[PDB]
Amino acid sequence: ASAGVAVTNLNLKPGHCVEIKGSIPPDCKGFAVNLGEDASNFLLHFNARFDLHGDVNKIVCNSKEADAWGSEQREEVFPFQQGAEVMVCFEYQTQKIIIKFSSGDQFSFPVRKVLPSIPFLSLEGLAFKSITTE
Amino acid sequence: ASAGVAVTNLNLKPGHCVEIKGSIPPDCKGFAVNLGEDASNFLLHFNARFDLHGDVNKIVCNSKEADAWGSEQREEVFPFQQGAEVMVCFEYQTQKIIIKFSSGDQFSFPVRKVLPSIPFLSLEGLAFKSITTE
């Protein structure tokens, strides 16, 4: 019940973070937060699947390069429920991106292409409330 | 040189608002916040001029359609300091856009074109910190 917001010139630099605060529709099959250069190049594609692509309550991360998906990293921790409010924070480190939830849960993804700064961010299926940088 | 963040798919419908928060450089001649359809069509171009084009500490507002600027509406209230943080909110109503300053100050600008929703937002010469919809 939505189409995601897109942000350009975010210019996220190593050692900094982006915190998204949003709301999950009560029939959301899954939602995604993409950090990259454009819709064909993602350093991180964070996908929380409620029931989608054969995944039920599972987090799938991956990168994309020239429209081609890399190898997925699945995560067991799934602190979400349809209709709730998400509060995610992404810290950019040259080696990895640390994802932290208000739940107290944390995990990282490895950086496969170091960027001097990250210019693009987009959301899907997530009704955005506020986006912040630090 | 120095523009900034551009948000697309903002989907601001009447009766809703967006609050921008950011940092003003210490040597800032002026900054802007744009709302509209794209880079050539602004329902509102909000330009706070510290010292620009003969306007010193003034606020100039205008609309733009197909790169052609419309009638400027100047304002004398200027609650901004260089090298400091700012926070502005824009409320969209089908007939006018209400602009409010952290200072309690407020004024409106007429909607010269009613859009079912407002798709685009961009900042120029203002360091982005956060954007919040309500």
Ligand SMILES: OC[C@H]1O[C@@H](S[C@@H]2O[C@H](CO)[C@H](O)[C@H](O)[C@H]2O)[C@H](O)[C@@H](O)[C@H]1O
């Ligand atoms: O990797 C993220 C993308 O995942 C696919 S669904 C993906 O499909 C492959 C087959 O190509 C395998 O079945 C995986 O098990 C499955 O996760 C999505 O369609 C994309 O939008 C990304 O989310």
Ligand SMILES: OC[C@H]1O[C@@H](S[C@@H]2O[C@H](CO)[C@H](O)[C@H](O)[C@H]2O)[C@H](O)[C@@H](O)[C@H]1O
């Ligand atoms: O209307 C806001 C835009 O104003 C121009 S500067 C503008 O120039 C016209 C003539 O071309 C008149 O002199 C106006 O008095 C003067 O303000 C800016 O370059 C744009 O960025 C908008 O701020």
